[PDB]
Design a protein around this ligand. Structure first.
Ligand code: HEM
Ligand code: HEM
Ligand SMILES: [Cl-]
Ligand SMILES: [Cl-]
Ligand code: NA
Ligand code: NA
Lengths: 713, 713
């Protein structure tokens, strides 16, 4: 059946903005997962999970009699698709159970692990999400084997369809680099926003870079991918050594014995895949990655044997039974247990990528300290495992249940507690009046609040106006934020705040974060008034102000908007058309197409553009909140042509006279071109639409202002 | 960016069932288009449309000074995508303004027509939909030019994204037959459900079949395609001769002058396409189809000149200026006006397909009769134009405004008025009790009501339980409907009805239509009681019984379910996998994936299967309303394999014992395979879900029972 994507393969795609509708959701519209989880008997689930670890099923027999390793692997893959560049991936939505992740080659046989979990998911039903369960299972596996975890938070609600993520352009699973859709260029530079070396891998190739078994060069790939998942050297060493304390790899026979991945398998396979023709197909004969490595003498017990072996032996290159490169300690005795035959033992083995921890010089220092000081290794691994599995969960206010760690970590972008009464409605009105009396303009007010709030991304729930991090490094100096203009606005708002707080009794105070938002609300109210409409913009206090010391500057970098079509801003020149970047930003802000459309057309005429550019400012009453953008954009009396200077800027001239009326960018003019967006623009540009425009604009503005307000959830 | 569709191109696609969400819709959730239209001043819109007809715009100058022809073509094409096979296409959703239809070659320059309408759309806003406006504008064009229409109904709500329609498999626009994705096979047999001869055409090729200019062979294609659009010979001759009484074609220069269609055009084209490099590119120089024909001496006025010319001359084959085949009148004088130069005239011309109306023997008889009796021609064309443009609108209860024709037509599948008091809640309880006392079983009561109601399709809003057409030819004899069992149930229900109606005072009576549905309700109630649950199923009376004479048997044939996954029924063997057919039927029924899931799992355990098949009946308590289907389908204790006899039937055996537990079809087992469906099955198969399953099932049941109930909208 030929589709629109087939006829017009480069048209913009809006269906990313309408995923996750009420239509696809089997739960009622009022279902609240946090309420369900908060009444779950978590202790009882964990007891069930404990028992499962050593209850072997014949259709996928447990190695060593214990599923713990398989489950740690499962939970680390659940979390391990995360990319800091856009916050997509991670464990937070349980996406491992949907395409394409359920069928990535790095997730081979995790379909078995997920299936083992069904009886428990079934027992507790909607009170524990799959997303929570994958992670909880990994924790319980660690605990069952003697490892003390740092804690666990619930609150990952399940999702019901695949997320739309760019995982790369290769059309072949695992394609080595250098092909026609290579994700590398230059001196081994991986394209943003990717965080893996080959399509269908979690991070790196366990045999080495493009299969070359050189630990040193494999370390460079480890470091790069891990950094693109927000982990530094110490965290990376702790995570890899920690995880490979447990279990084993599977490569009992040649890879060609393994059949179709789950999305390709027959219907009778009932959602499982990688069925193997090698011997029994499972257990002692299992083939997963094609490597055959068991790291430690006690694969079902926490120990410090991974570093004892890594440093204690000299290693030589050998091949698994499937032909993959791996390493053996030939000088060793057969000290490693066999997974099923109590009468067999094996020599110690390692992956290329494990040897990286000893032969990369920066890693060796850390490895050695963890070898000599295994308590430091256990503490690091516990912290990094928590971070790994909670990195995309958002503000601590979303964390549920009795096991949440009390320690506040810098990576969580922490917000201080509020310990004082909040402003009320009359106070908000008085502050809005003081703000407008200061001389700050509609444009200044709207721009500053937009800049503060629109760093939010729903992918990992980082960013937003809570914290007032706009006033701190590095946000204050981001080019999009107009650093000198922003400094003048913030100074005036801070003086207002100081005056208001100084006049209060009884501990009542307003935060700067709240005032930035409220002042943007005043700007929108005044814009509506400029257009002859009295409206009240809703405003919810309770934001707090974070300090510089509570703000990791390096980790904030990935939130910098380099493209923000809402402010007609592009930091430099990109391969991807600006309209594509606009939809991407909309998806991250959780906006539908209609909400995107209303919001942009309003911001244009409020003076939100960076630099006060006239591009898209299709009004003669700037700073009045009207539907002028759409009425003028859709006026057939105006003809548009790309400029000679810049093919991405367009001039709109009167069709009869040739007089120049407006200029625009691709972001502006897509609303008059794309057939779905233009149908939207038509609604808002019609003669009956002034009231609808204003209401829908105020509603989306308020949505944006509240994106990180999980304290009010 | 590689997608799931790329990796797994034949995996089932559920996003068709979650199109048209509240997310993509710019109107608020409570917007009611019928209420908006009812307050429109239709007389005012029509005056603006009359003015527009002769308000020529320089960017697309009106032929003969009058856009009427262009607009009739625009309306005919809006309605002309309709296929009786599935009810998809047609004018009823305004899909002409979206991909792919906005860019079909046959809709070239209709983007201009649509744009001429924007000032009117804009003026009236939400009170007139694009979908209604296209049709209204065609009617007003006809009226402007002297032709009295039969009527007009409003009520076509706009839609906001492309509908998912199978338009064929060709990957080349306009591809001639016999290619790798040929829509023809055999003795020119067009594949169902298609109703056009080439990809991107409305019906036929105006040059002739695959471009060969034989009017007789063209006639065969006209007859077949028009019959696939629900028109017979009389209506087809009236429509083609009526339409080509007006206006002209456009082929002033070679097609190679015309540029990108709208979805491929640059952003500066602002939603328009087919920009031409030939001379001025418009007006006297216009290129649309490549043909250059003007049919009549008065192209802006209704006349009898089409048939005078058709019969009055002998025709010679010639070429337009673009090289296309067309016909010219032998020895004729230059009597046809030029569109722009009052000093030029032209000889009469015709398309191959116009000559079909004279050279096909059956058409010639009709054409002659219309030539001799032009009042018969006028009346038939009025009637046919109304049918054309309203065929997908559904029951008359949907028709809005002051111009709706009072005459009831056979094609509207008319339902008689109700002229008596309706049963109340006490009466409903009394009838449900008599139904349960009669001996009829849960399976019989559910099956019959399913059969009556599940004929509805939302594509053209035909079918459903109103009417009690299940008791008439041809529904009573459909294989899916189990004709002998159906007759036994109808006999018992009719005796209950007769007894009930005979005991009433005043004119209170229950229709058989209502009783069929009420009796199904009772069956679901009894099923829930069998499972130990106390459930009341909602019921809305008000259906009436249609007569056989109000039920066109040939037009009902296209509603026969040849595949009905909900009854585990497949009439024969199809190219398309049964799961694909299931989703297609769910889309027709307007169900989401969750609704499809709940409904199928319930139907299976209630005994709705055709033939009492055990396939999918995964319960030991048939006729009790439980979530057994899901709990058993997801039990990993059972292993599934395709049978030796039939690869599309599967056996579920105890994994440890080998004992046979169940059998299933692909429709059954897709719920345990497809990763989105299995996620849904899991919610309903969980230990906390029995009550939710029951409630959700009763809701979807009632939805299906009410699909055609536009008298309660
Ligand atoms: C450089 C990073 C890493 C590489 C290349 C990698 C590579 C692999 C490979 C190839 C397997 C074998 C899969 C099989 O054949 O069954 C695996 C197993 C395992 N990995 Fe990793 N690993 C990485 C990091 C991690 C991390 C961060 C964790 C967790 C903290 C982890 C935990 C495990 C566990 C527990 C297994 C055992 C699975 C079982 O017992 O079934 N690994 N690793
Ligand atoms: C066998 C069926 C038909 C064929 C093959 C056919 C073909 C065509 C073509 C090729 C054009 C020229 C397009 C252009 O170059 O501008 C056209 C124009 C038109 N047809 Fe048809 N047609 C069919 C049926 C219809 C019907 C059912 C109606 C309406 C009831 C219709 C009314 C129009 C009118 C009004 C125009 C004139 C457009 C103008 O003045 O711009 N035709 N037709
Ligand atoms: Cl994601
Ligand atoms: Cl459609
Ligand atoms: Na994420
Ligand atoms: Na339709």
């Amino acid at each position: 059946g030929t589709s629109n994507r087939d006829w017009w393969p480069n048209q913009l795609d809006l269906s990313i903005l309408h995923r996750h509708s009420s239509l696809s959701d089997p739960m009622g519209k009022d279902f609240n997962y946090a309420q369900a989880f908060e009444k779950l008997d978590l202790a009882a689930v964990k007891r069930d999970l404990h028992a499962l670890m050593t209850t072997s099923q014949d259709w996928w027999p447990a190695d060593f009699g214990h599923y713990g390793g398989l489950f740690i692997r499962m939970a680390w893959h659940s979390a391990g698709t995360y990319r800091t560049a856009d916050g997509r991936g991670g464990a937070g939505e349980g996406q491992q159970r949907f395409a394409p992740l359920n069928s990535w080659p790095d997730n081979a046989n995790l379909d078995k692990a997920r299936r083992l979990l069904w009886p428990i998911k079934q027992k507790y039903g909607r009170a524990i999400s799959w997303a929570d369960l994958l992670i909880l299972t990994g924790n319980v596996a660690l605990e069952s084997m003697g490892f003390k975890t740092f804690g666990f938070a619930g609150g990952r609600a399940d999702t019901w369809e695949p997320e739309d993520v760019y995982w790369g352009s290769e059309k072949i699973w695992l394609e080595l680099s250098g092909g026609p859709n290579s994700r590398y260029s230059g001196d081994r530079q991986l394209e943003n926003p990717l965080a893996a070396v080959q399509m269908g891998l979690i991070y790196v190739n366990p045999e080495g870079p493009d299969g070359n078994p050189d630990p040193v060069a494999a370390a460079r790939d480890i470091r790069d991918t891990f950094a693109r998942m927000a982990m530094n050297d110490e965290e990376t060493v702790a995570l890899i050594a920690g995880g490979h304390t447990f279990g084993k790899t599977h490569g009992a026979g040649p890879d060609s014995n393994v059949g179709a991945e789950p999305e390709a398998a027959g219907i009778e396979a009932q959602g499982l895949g990688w069925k193997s023709a090698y011997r029994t197909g499972k257990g002692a004969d299992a083939i997963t990655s094609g490597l055959e490595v068991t790291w430690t003498t006690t694969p079902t017990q926490w120990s410090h044997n991974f570093f004892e072996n890594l440093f204690g032996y000299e290693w030589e290159l050998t091949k698994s039974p499937a032909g993959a490169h791996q390493w053996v300690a030939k000088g060793a005795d057969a000290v490693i247990p066999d997974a099923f035959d109590p009468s067999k033992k094996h020599r110690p083995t390692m992956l290329t990528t494990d040897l990286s921890l000893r032969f990369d010089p920066a890693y060796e220092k850390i490895s050695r300290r963890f070898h000599e000081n295994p308590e430091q290794f256990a503490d690091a691994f516990a912290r990094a495992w928590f971070k790994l599995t909670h990195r995309d969960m958002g503000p601590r206010a979303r964390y549920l249940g009795p096991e949440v760690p009390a320690e506040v970590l810098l990576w969580q972008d922490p917000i201080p507690a509020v310990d004082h009464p909040l402003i009320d409605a009359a106070d908000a009105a008085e502050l809005k009046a003081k703000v407008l009396a200061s001389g700050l303009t509609v444009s200044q007010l709207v721009s500053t609040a937009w800049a503060a709030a629109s760093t939010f991304r729903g992918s990992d729930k980082r960013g937003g106006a809570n914290g007032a991090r706009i006033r701190l490094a590095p946000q204050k100096d981001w080019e999009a934020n107009q650093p000198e203009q922003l400094a003048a606005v913030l100074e005036t708002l801070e003086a207002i705040r100081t005056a208001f707080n100084g006049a209060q009794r009884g501990g009542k105070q307003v935060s700067l974060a709240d005032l930035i938002v409220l002042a943007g609300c005043a700007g929108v109210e005044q814009a509506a008034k400029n257009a002859g409409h009295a409206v009240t913009v809703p405003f919810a206090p309770g934001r707090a102000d974070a300090s510089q010391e509570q703000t990791d500057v390096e980790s904030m970098a990935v939130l910098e908007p380099v493209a923000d079509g809402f402010r007609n801003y592009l930091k430099g020149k990109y391969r991807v058309p600006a309209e594509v970047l606009l939809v991407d930003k909309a998806q991250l802000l959780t906006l539908s197409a209609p909400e995107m459309t209303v919001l942009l057309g309003g911001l244009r005429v409020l003076g939100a553009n960076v630099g006060q550019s006239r591009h898209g400012v299709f009004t003669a009453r700037e700073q009045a909140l009207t539907n002028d953008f759409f009425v003028n954009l859709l006026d057939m009396g105006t003809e548009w042509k790309p400029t000679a200077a810049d093919a991405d800027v367009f001039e709109g001239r009167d069709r009869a006279t040739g007089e120049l009326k407006w200029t625009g960018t691709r972001v502006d003019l897509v609303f008059g071109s794309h057939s779905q967006l233009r149908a939207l623009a038509e609604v808002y540009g019609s003669a009956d639409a002034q009231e609808k425009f204003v209401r829908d604009f105020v509603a989306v503005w308020n949505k944006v202002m509240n994106l990180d307000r999980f304290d009010l959830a």
